[PDB]
Paper text:
The abundant ssDNA-binding protein, replication protein A, transiently engages the single-stranded 3′ tail, but is replaced by RAD51, whose nucleation on ssDNA is stabilized by the evolutionarily conserved BRC repeat motifs within the BRCA2 tumour suppressor protein. RAD51 bound to adenosine triphosphate (ATP) arranges itself on ssDNA into a dynamic, helical nucleoprotein filament—the presynaptic filament—that invades duplex DNA to search for a sequence homologous to the ssDNA tail. Protomers of RAD51 and its orthologues share a structurally conserved, ATP-binding core catalytic domain. ATP hydrolysis by the catalytic activity of RAD51 allows the components of the repair reaction to dissociate.
Sample preparation for full-length human RAD51 assembled on ssDNA in the presence of the ATP analogue, AMP-PNP, with methods for electron cryo-microscopy, are described elsewhere (‘Materials and Methods’ section). Calculation of a local resolution map showed resolution ranging from 3.5 to 5.0Å, while the previously reported ‘gold-standard’ FSC criterion indicated an average resolution of 4.2Å at a cutoff level of 0.143. The fitted PDB coordinates, refined in REFMAC were validated by FSC to 4.1Å. The overall architecture of the human RAD51 presynaptic filament with 6 protomers docked into the EM map when viewed perpendicular or longitudinal to the filament axis reveals that like RecA, human RAD51 protomers form a chain that encases ssDNA as a 1-start helix to create the presynaptic filament. The angular displacement (twist) between protomers in the presynaptic RAD51 filament is constant at 56.2°, encompassing 6.4 protomers per turn of the helix. ssDNA (red ribbon) lies between the inner surface of the protomers and the filament axis. The fitting suggested that, just as in the RecA filament, the presynaptic human RAD51 filament engages the ssDNA backbone, exposing the nucleotide bases for homologous pairing reactions. ssDNA within our fitted model for the presynaptic filament lies close to the filament axis, and most likely binds the inner surface of RAD51 protomers via the L1 and L2 loop regions which encircle it, with each protomer making three contacts with ssDNA. Moreover, our model with fitted ssDNA suggests a stoichiometry of three nucleotides per RAD51 protomer in a filament with pitch 103Å, incorporating 6.4 protomers per turn. We also carried out 3D classification and refinement with imposed dimer symmetry; again, no observable widening of the α-helices was detected. These observations suggest that the protomer–protomer interface in the human RAD51 presynaptic filament is invariant, similar to RecA, but distinct from what has been proposed for mutant yeast Rad51. However, in our model for the active presynaptic filament of RAD51 bound to the non-hydrolyzable ATP analogue AMP-PNP, the binding site for the Phe-X-X-Ala module is buried in the RAD51 protomer–protomer interface, and therefore likely to be inaccessible for BRC repeat binding.
Author numbering:
A (entry chain C), B (entry chain B), C (entry chain A): 20 to 274, 284 to 339
The structure:
Amino acid sequence: FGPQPISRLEQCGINANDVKKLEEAGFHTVEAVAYAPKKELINIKGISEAKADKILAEAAKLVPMGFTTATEFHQRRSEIIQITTGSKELDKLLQGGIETGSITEMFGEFRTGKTQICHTLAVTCQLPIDRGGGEGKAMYIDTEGTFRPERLLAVAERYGLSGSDVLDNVAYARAFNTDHQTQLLYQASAMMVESRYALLIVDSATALYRTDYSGRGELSARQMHLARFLRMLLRLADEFGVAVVITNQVVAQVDKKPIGGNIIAHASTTRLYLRKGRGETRICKIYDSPCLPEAEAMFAINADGVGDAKD
Amino acid sequence: FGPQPISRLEQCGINANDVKKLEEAGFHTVEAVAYAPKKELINIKGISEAKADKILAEAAKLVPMGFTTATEFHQRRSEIIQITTGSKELDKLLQGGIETGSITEMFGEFRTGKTQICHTLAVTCQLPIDRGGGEGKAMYIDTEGTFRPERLLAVAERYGLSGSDVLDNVAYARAFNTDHQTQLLYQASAMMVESRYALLIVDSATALYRTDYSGRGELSARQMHLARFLRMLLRLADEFGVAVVITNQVVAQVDKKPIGGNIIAHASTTRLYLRKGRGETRICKIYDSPCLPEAEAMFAINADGVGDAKD
Amino acid sequence: FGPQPISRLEQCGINANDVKKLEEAGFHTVEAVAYAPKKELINIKGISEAKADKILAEAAKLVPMGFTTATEFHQRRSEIIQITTGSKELDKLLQGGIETGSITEMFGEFRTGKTQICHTLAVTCQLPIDRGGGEGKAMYIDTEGTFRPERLLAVAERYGLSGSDVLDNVAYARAFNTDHQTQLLYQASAMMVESRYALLIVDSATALYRTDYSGRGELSARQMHLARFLRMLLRLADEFGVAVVITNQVVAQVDKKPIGGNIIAHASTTRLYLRKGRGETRICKIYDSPCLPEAEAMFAINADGVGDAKD
Ligand SMILES: Nc1ncnc2c1ncn2[C@@H]1O[C@H](COP(=O)(O)OP(=O)(O)NP(=O)(O)O)[C@@H](O)[C@H]1O
Ligand SMILES: Nc1ncnc2c1ncn2[C@@H]1O[C@H](COP(=O)(O)OP(=O)(O)NP(=O)(O)O)[C@@H](O)[C@H]1O
Ligand SMILES: Nc1ncnc2c1ncn2[C@@H]1O[C@H](COP(=O)(O)OP(=O)(O)NP(=O)(O)O)[C@@H](O)[C@H]1O
């Protein structure tokens, strides 16, 4: 029920031809269709004045904000679900868990468990609201080929759900390059129209972007392309309130650091760092998150997935 | 009491039809209606000569400057309120605080606390004049979705005010694109007609402008659009004397820098830089401000908001 | 004593009605009334032949040049006062200072100190001729709202003058748009009739002109309007010999530059560039000035105003 469909903005100014171009353009709702600047709609082989009428009409009949106090907004935030991670110590750290209708991503070294957390979340989101993760199908865009359904099965056994049913409600595709990476998101937006989603794990979203192209010159272009990809996610984030989790790679300071420069920085509504401890033990620390201060946690990696310190 | 309303410029040349177009055009006062060039009024389906009469009539009965010495002006500046930041060290830096009827904005890296300062100011402005921040409702245009009423509650507890009352006097809306960004300002101007305002925090005003469009070609257009947005703010700044605070993003030099190019530069009646120090500690330094020289400060981020170096 | 009044051109052809229109037209002298071509006077609801008689009469009794050698003119240039800047290094650069009965303007980046220099000059012009700046009241048209009387007080303390008296002899108004910008100049011309003036700082004269209107189309109009504004200044420059200083904004080359195209180019009787150096230090360099070739200078910004390199 979360969004209002495109076929709803059919007041008296949605003809066949009019709405024959908006869907194909990549608009499968009224929200993301309003959210768009005159700039957007005009660049899609429409008529200047015809397209302008389309905007104003929909906008009046979509609640396009206009200083709606703060008390009312405060209540809005109380209704937002927070997904459980499976570790009590990790849950405590997030004062509940991973926020929806936001951007939340972790980076660390290889072996640290960023890929791990994603698999665990893919299952934990397939539960009753009362048991943390609220009902809603999970989508996984992997870029590393590090998807392992077997890992999901072990998590399903811990939480005592039918593996086969859980795997029906997690959806997968592999993005293989930058242009594909962006392109895949348009398919994503269509997917969440038909059925209610809760979760995105985009495995290594930004990690592809380093091998992708350039290096040090015509990187301007990379930052532009990433920023464009990232704004789309955020569009997708407020439109439906699906929870965006991105995986990140790191680079040494050489004079230990989340890659992609700053563009990813300003995007992040919540940041996390992983590093390896002794044996199976691992450390998560918050980096940048508006809500709660910087804090550390012990947790471990069990055969059941991401759990508390077995010791 | 700060402005004179549109229905005041009703001497003998404000008919129904005459004043039926000025409001809808985006004029909710006599100040901003005078401040306008013949250019402005003429571009709004009015009559050349009819509109010209409207200008001259209002202008004579609005004190449209004309070399009113400097001693008189000096006294005017003594009457301007300076908002407190909550950190004594930070307050000292601004020889009182954030000037009203101006443009004051900070930029830094992610995690630095630009968003932080905004939330803190949103509360500090809801106080008696004697306790720094003068009485007058706060308006928050966010673009990042980094608004957290919870953060405001912690600040309210420190200063011992009713959270619920404070949240009634802070107003919120999210701008989602360039055209929306500008559009939202027209609603803003109407808002401050009905009730007395003190504060604007526009979170990431300029930060939206990078993902917004183009890059390196047809950027001319971006600068034009930003400059237009920025002049409107300034219009709003002298008209009512509401205090404008803008958040900014940064870009690496690649051969560390406030984005949007120079257009934002000339706008700024006061500039600030934030960077991260060791632990919870942070550094603010002044950049460009006509009044006081370049100086540095230690401050920290407490659970109460932006405070002094706990140490 | 600098000009001859309008009521002086009352030989035998200045009636009530005749001189009832020239003042209101914007003529408060014989100089600017003579400099005007037939075109001017005829466009102000006068009689063709009546207005023609008005021209010829005044012209005969105003010394309207007529190829007056070179040697005599050379002596005229020796009598022109040159205002001090307060920095010995900066003074040396101008072989004395800012020429009067001319157009002298600086541009640079934000933070560079163009606004700074203006404030400093506003005080330095309130002195005995022997101490640089010659006696005569200062007028400041600001467009940015970057006027700070406090800055003038610090300068007054250095030069040991009564702040209150100095502020009585600096006059201020804010121009808020193009039409206002031009309009304000007519009030200016009247101001200098009653009392002897020395100085104009027009803060950001041209800087308003970019946000003002258009962009890339119907810019021909901007050029026309600026050129008209600029010619008026020059009229004001030869008429009274009041010293015109204009502030300018800059634009990136995008393939660092004084804004407003070429029209400002030909106007400039002397040009200056500012850029930031290390710490409080700044560099001024001459651009285009007929008199002395291109040279560079170190100077600094002290709490006393614009001074020499403290080091
Ligand atoms: N079934 C399992 N039970 C317990 N531990 C496991 C299991 N499978 C793998 N591990 C270990 O748990 C750790 C998890 O980190 P891992 O998620 O593999 O890092 P990562 O995020 O994949 N790095 P990248 O390869 O760049 O994506 C590894 O060090 C593995 O050896
Ligand atoms: N309740 C709290 N008490 C103390 N510290 C906090 C609290 N909440 C968050 N923090 C931390 O304080 C810092 C504030 O910086 P922050 O305001 O989040 O940067 P920012 O301006 O939001 N960057 P952006 O995400 O681009 O808008 C962060 O590094 C947080 O970890
Ligand atoms: N009282 C003071 N003493 C010493 N330095 C100061 C003082 N006040 C301001 N400054 C600094 O001196 C510099 C002067 O430049 P400034 O005149 O502010 O540039 P500008 O011409 O105003 N640019 P714009 O904002 O476009 O008009 C700034 O970088 C200030 O931080």
